[PDB]
């Protein structure tokens, strides 16, 4: 194919790799670590932000000289999205808000956003589109959030056949939501299985899938290497931290394994457990 797309030597810091990556969202958490691993790989990253330029200013300089690029977009029209996919080799859907707002509920982010971008991505000629989702988001009960992600999975499975539908379990890191919610509470416990997986294993798997062809169409789900009790986990978090509502239903309800579909070691990246990284990341206790 065309020149300035072929790879060049080593990786990172204006060592040009093959991909031209359009990443949605990325002002939050997982998109930020993904932009960081692409800058470590050293590719050109198009990020659209609807938000303030100051947040992407603080998550900005991880790209090298003129590598990342900014534009503006919304969840109403198609012109800015087509402007985002004017020239893009690969593109990833990493969108979502864990609490309903005025202008957008859990409905129509997961419904309205992937329709338009999957339509214009299949039209405007991109390859290897990757869509995240949550693990075990089904038609089943107790979560408008998870049934809406099941609706979005139905649409992204139906239109644009050649995707990579992917889903991790609840992930933990430096700016995690639910682990900080565990540290910042106030409290009761049941029996509920749950596997957490550290964030860099997920993003190594994502970038390996984004540079690897001939494993596409296969949906993936990610595996915590321990998969143990919720209440033991709260005990361990309070132990390492030295101290004695749709979200709370999501964390209490269920997190199970699904042996139908492949995971980490079927892609070839080492899993890292909760305990090592939790000693690493649980700062911000007393003194």
């Amino acid at each position: 194919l065309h020149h300035a797309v072929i790879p060049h030597g080593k990786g990172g810091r204006s060592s040009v790799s093959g991909i031209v990556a359009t990443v949605f969202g990325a002002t939050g958490f997982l998109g930020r670590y993904l932009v960081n691993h692409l800058g470590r790989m050293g590719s050109q990253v198009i990020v659209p932000y609807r938000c303030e330029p100051y947040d992407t200013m603080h998550l900005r300089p991880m790209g090298d000289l003129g590598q990342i690029i900014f534009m503006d977009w919304n969840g109403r029209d198609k012109d800015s999205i087509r402007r985002a996919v004017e020239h893009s080799n690969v593109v990833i859907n990493l969108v979502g808000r864990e609490w309903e707002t005025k202008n957008f509920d859990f409905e129509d982010v997961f419904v309205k956003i992937p329709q338009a971008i999957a339509q214009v991505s299949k039209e405007a000629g991109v390859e290897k589109f990757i869509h995240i989702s949550h693990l075990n988001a089904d038609i089943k009960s107790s979560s408008k959030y998870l049934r809406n992600k099941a609706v979005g999975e139905k649409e992204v499975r139906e239109t644009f056949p050649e995707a990579t539908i992917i889903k991790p379990a609840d992930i933990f890191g430096r700016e995690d939501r639910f682990l900080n919610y565990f540290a910042n509470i106030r409290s009761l416990g049941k029996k509920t299985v749950k596997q957490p997986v550290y964030i860099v294993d997920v993003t190594k798997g994502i970038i390996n899938a984004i540079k690897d062809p001939d494993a596409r169409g296969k949906t993936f789900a990610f595996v915590g290497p321990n998969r143990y009790l919720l209440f033991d986990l709260v005990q361990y978090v309070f132990a390492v931290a030295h101290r004695p509502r749709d979200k709370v239903e999501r964390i209490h309800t269920t997190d199970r394994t699904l042996p139908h579909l492949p995971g980490l070691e079927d892609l070839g990246v080492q899993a890292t457990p909760l305990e090592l990284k939790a000693i690493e990341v649980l700062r911000r206790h007393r003194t």
């Binding site: 990172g12 810091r13 204006s14 060592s15 960081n36 691993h37 300089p61 991880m62 000289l65 430096r174």
Partner: protein, 208 residues
């Protein structure tokens, strides 16, 4: 001749010639070359086993005081069995004269560490250790000054290239500033400028 040519004074030339033959008379154990340039400064070229005797002599003796110390650089000349050159650069306070003690050395054998007799030599010696690698035996304090603490390579050799092997950048994966091998933005295009036709005739080395 008379305009725009910096005139030399043969008085300092003759006096430093007499002083140089005097030094070569009175310390025959260590003297190899006593050379005088056209701009009349003395250069005494010395084996590295008489550093302490020559400096303990040249600090005193009332024919040449020379209290003041300056530049020590061990100017790296390859194509020699002994690469580096320690250059002591001594200055009088009563006499207004400058002498250059050029003593030679290699990468490994220590010189005698003049800090016992010239107190100024301490950070000069620490600098030469941190930039070149000439170890100083019987010296109190050898640490690293002018380089990073996680750094090694003795960068002012000729064998250390102009760019670095390490280069820092911040990354948020570990929330800190980490070291990566060098990935420049431009080549530093080095221009060949050793032009032929022998711009100086008096310095023609004997060929074979």
């Amino acid at each position: 001749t008379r305009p725009t040519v910096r005139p030399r004074n043969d008085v300092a030339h003759k006096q430093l010639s007499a002083f140089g033959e005097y030094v070569a008379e009175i310390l025959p154990k260590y003297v190899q070359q006593v050379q005088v340039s056209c701009f009349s400064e003395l250069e005494i070229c010395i084996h590295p086993d008489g550093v302490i005797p020559v400096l303990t002599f040249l600090r005193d003796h009332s024919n040449a005081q020379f209290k003041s110390l300056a530049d020590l650089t061990a100017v790296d000349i390859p194509t020699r069995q002994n690469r580096f050159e320690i250059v002591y650069n001594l200055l009088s306070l009563r006499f207004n004269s400058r002498i250059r003690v050029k003593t030679y050395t290699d990468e490994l054998t220590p010189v005698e560490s003049s800090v016992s007799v010239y107190k100024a030599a301490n950070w000069y010696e620490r600098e030469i250790w941190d930039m070149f690698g000439v170890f100083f035996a019987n010296h109190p304090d050898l640490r690293r000054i002018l380089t990073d603490y996680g750094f090694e390579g003795h960068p002012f050799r000729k064998d250390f290239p102009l760019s670095g092997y390490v280069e820092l950048r911040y990354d948020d994966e570990v929330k800190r500033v980490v070291a990566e091998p060098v990935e420049l933005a431009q080549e530093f295009r080095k221009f060949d400028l050793n032009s032929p036709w022998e711009a100086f005739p008096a310095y023609r080395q004997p060929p074979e």
